[PDB]
Amino acid sequence: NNMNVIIADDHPIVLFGIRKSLEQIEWVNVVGEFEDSTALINNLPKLDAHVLITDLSMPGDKYGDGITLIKYIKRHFPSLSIIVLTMNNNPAILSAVLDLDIEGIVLKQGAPTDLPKALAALQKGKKFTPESVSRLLEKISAGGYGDKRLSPKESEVLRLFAEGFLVTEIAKKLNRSIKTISSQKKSAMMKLGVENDIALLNYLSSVTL
């Protein structure tokens, strides 16, 4: 069973690496390489791909990147198997990708064999989870907020935080007190499992909802 593979990453050095690590796998065929999400979504309908190995952070205004792009691929190419290869190791981001029920997550900070092992497992209709992914996924699992989703109010505050506004600007913009905005903000944070402001913005750069 040959597997036709599409690779997507905004760093061409990584694309070369992915091919370099896949050259030893005889049953893998690379039918396309893309560096932004517009080019990827445009070429998906014309290649007959079985698997996508995709990055999370990439350019592309039309279809975006991150969780948004992956959801989009799931809806419109449901038979396509997805493995995410990402440097974005924020537990909240990775738990969000795991929620999408794709065929694997691999970290660029992980082991050199993690990607070929993910593909090997997929050939056997199985899921490979590296330890490096498992560890920080258990942090969010254990804490116990994985089930909960954002309210419209919470989403509203965070969407403006995602365009770089401060708590005092959002209060004025939504016509709410600082106390209310902060309470809404911290409640949203507890749900997403992000413990500080840098973690929150990094989460917000990978989801646009």
- From the list ligand BEF, a copy of itself, Mg ion, none, partner contacted by residue 86 (C-beta under 5 to 8 A by kind): ligand BEF
- From the list ligand BEF, Mg ion, a copy of itself, none, partner contacted by residue 111 (C-beta under 5 to 8 A by kind): a copy of itself
Distances (CA, A) of 38 to 8, 13, 56, 164, 209: 11, 20, 14, 25, 19
Instruction: Give all strands of the β-sheet with 3-8 in edge-to-edge order.
Output: 28-34, 3-8, 51-54, 81-86, 104-107
Q: Angle at Cα 61 formed by Cα 97 and Cα 185, nearest 5°?
A: 55
Interacting residue with Mg ion among 55, 103, 114, 156 (CB under 5 A): 55
- How large is the C-alpha radius of gyration of the chain? 18
Residue 195 binds to Mg ion (criterion: CB under 5 A): no
List the x/- string, 117-136, binding to Mg ion by CB under 5 A. --------------------
Interacting residue with ligand BEF among 3, 5, 41, 56 (CB under 6 A): 56
Least distance to ligand BEF, CB of residue 104, Å: 14
Rounded CA-CA distance 113/199 in Å is: 28
- From the list a copy of itself, ligand BEF, Mg ion, none, partner contacted by residue 20 (C-beta under 5 to 8 A by kind): a copy of itself
The burial of 168, by beta-carbon neighbours within 10 Å (0-12 exposed, 13-18 middle, 19 or more buried), is given as exposed
Residues numbered 71 to 110 that lie near ligand BEF (CB under 6 A) are: 86-88, 108
Rounded CA-CA distance 22/27 in Å is: 9
Residues numbered 136 to 165 that lie near a copy of itself (CB under 8 A) are: 161-162, 164
Rounded CA-CA distance 83/29 in Å is: 15
Residues numbered 25 to 84 that lie near a copy of itself (CB under 8 A) are: none
Q: How many residues bind a copy of itself (CB under 8 A)?
A: 33
Torsional sign, CA 9, 119, 126, 43: positive
Footprint of a copy of itself on this chain (CB under 8 A)? Answer: 10-21, 85, 87, 90, 108-112, 115, 161-162, 164, 166-167, 196-199, 201-202, 205
Footprint of Mg ion on this chain (CB under 5 A)? Answer: 10, 55, 57-58
